[PDB]
């Protein structure tokens, strides 16, 4: 029930994913102490609309009140931009952007560390991206989604962090949320063999502390039950013939848009 994208479909997500990454590349310079998250949200939206002539898939979604999600520190996800929420020195902040372009979505997010980073702030951010890269490196047809969550978890835990279990990455495309569910941890429940053309997200949410979270009153914002810091990075990718292509790659990523596996690349018949 997982949709297989069409070359044309794919070019579209590429455009979409590219637009999503640019929002993140653009926001960067405004992410600094004293900046309110409402303003960041503003910039983002203005950007999506006016310059990219696209639309935030988040804006008003099922009621969601802001253009992008800006989760600070113990906020795991769905953090709601608010003009009263100023960024502080040492904060860690996720900005989650989802853009719709020509009917296709581009979904990604990254962590920003404001001012002087904190030991743990820095480490979790690093570790979290790594868990994302790590999964990225394994994306390839024939692999089971389950081996990936497994890998993420293993890594994360070995690094002394936790993986939130309640929220996942997912198929995406014409629809914001599509199958499959992309768990960032092990699950006997998980059974998804990757096929080329599949487009989905990977967006491991990592707690410096315990994995338990708490959903807030507002119905959106998620936080760590123990109040430890939480970090997330996400990429939207397409499964290729031999690996994956990262649709939301940013200048600052240090992973290649295109990941291929030797064993899968085209080769002579006897090679
Ligand atoms: Na956080």
Curated annotation (Swiss-Prot):
Residues where a divalent metal cation 2 binds: 107, 170, 203, 234
Pfam families: Peptidase_M24
Sorted UniProt keywords: Aminopeptidase, Hydrolase, Metal-binding, Protease
CDD domains: MetAP1
GO cellular component, one term: cytosol
GO biological process, one term: proteolysis
Residues engaged in binding substrate: 78, 177
GO MF: initiator methionyl aminopeptidase activity; metal ion binding; metalloaminopeptidase activity
UniProt keyword annotation of Hydrolase present: yes
Residues involved in a divalent metal cation 1 binding: 96, 107, 234
Enzyme class: hydrolase
Catalytic activity: Release of N-terminal amino acids, preferentially methionine, from peptides and arylamides
Coiled coil, from the record: none
Enzyme Commission number(s) of this protein: 3.4.11.18
Cofactor note: Binds 2 divalent metal cations per subunit. Has a high-affinity and a low affinity metal-binding site. The true nature of the physiological cofactor is under debate. The enzyme is active with cobalt, zinc, manganese or divalent iron ions. Most likely, methionine aminopeptidases function as mononuclear Fe(2+)-metalloproteases under physiological conditions, and the catalytically relevant metal-binding site has been assigned to the histidine-containing high-affinity site.
Cofactor requirement: Co(2+); Zn(2+); Mn(2+); Fe(2+)
Function: Removes the N-terminal methionine from nascent proteins. The N-terminal methionine is often cleaved when the second residue in the primary sequence is small and uncharged (Met-Ala-, Cys, Gly, Pro, Ser, Thr, or Val). Requires deformylation of the N(alpha)-formylated initiator methionine before it can be hydrolyzed.
Subunit structure: Monomer.
HAMAP family linked: MetAP_1
Family, per entry: Belongs to the peptidase M24A family. Methionine aminopeptidase type 1 subfamily.
Listed name of the protein: Methionine aminopeptidase
Species this protein is from: Escherichia coli O157:H7
């Amino acid at each position: 029930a997982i949709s297989i994208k069409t070359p044309e479909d794919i070019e579209k997500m590429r455009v979409a994913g590219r637009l999503a990454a640019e929002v993140l590349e653009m926001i960067e310079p405004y992410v600094k102490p004293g900046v309110s998250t409402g303003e960041l949200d503003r910039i983002c939206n203005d950007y999506i609309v006016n310059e990219q002539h696209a639309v935030s898939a988040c804006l008003g979604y099922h009621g969601y009140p802001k253009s992008v999600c800006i989760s600070i520190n113990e906020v795991v996800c769905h953090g709601i931009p608010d003009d009263a929420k100023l960024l502080k020195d040492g904060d860690i902040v996720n900005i989650d952007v989802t853009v719709i372009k020509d009917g296709f979505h581009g979904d990604t997010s990254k962590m920003f560390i404001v001012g002087k980073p904190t030991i743990m702030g820095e480490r979790l951010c690093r570790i979290t991206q790594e868990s994302l890269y790590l999964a990225l490196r394994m994306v390839k047809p024939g692999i089971n989604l389950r081996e990936i969550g497994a890998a993420i978890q293993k890594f994360v835990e070995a690094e002394g962090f936790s993986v939130v279990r309640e929220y996942c990455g997912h198929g995406i495309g014409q629809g914001f949320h599509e199958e499959p569910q992309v768990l960032h941890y092990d699950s006997r429940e998980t059974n998804v063999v990757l096929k080329p053309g599949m487009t989905f997200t990977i967006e491991p949410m990592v707690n410096a502390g315990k994995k338990e979270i708490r959903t807030m009153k507002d119905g959106w914002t998620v936080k760590t039950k123990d109040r430890s810091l939480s970090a997330q990075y996400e990429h939207t990718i397409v499964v290729t013939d031999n690996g994956c292509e990262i649709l939301t790659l940013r200048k600052d990523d240090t992973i290649p848009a295109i990941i291929s596996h030797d064993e899968l690349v085209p080769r002579g018949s006897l090679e």
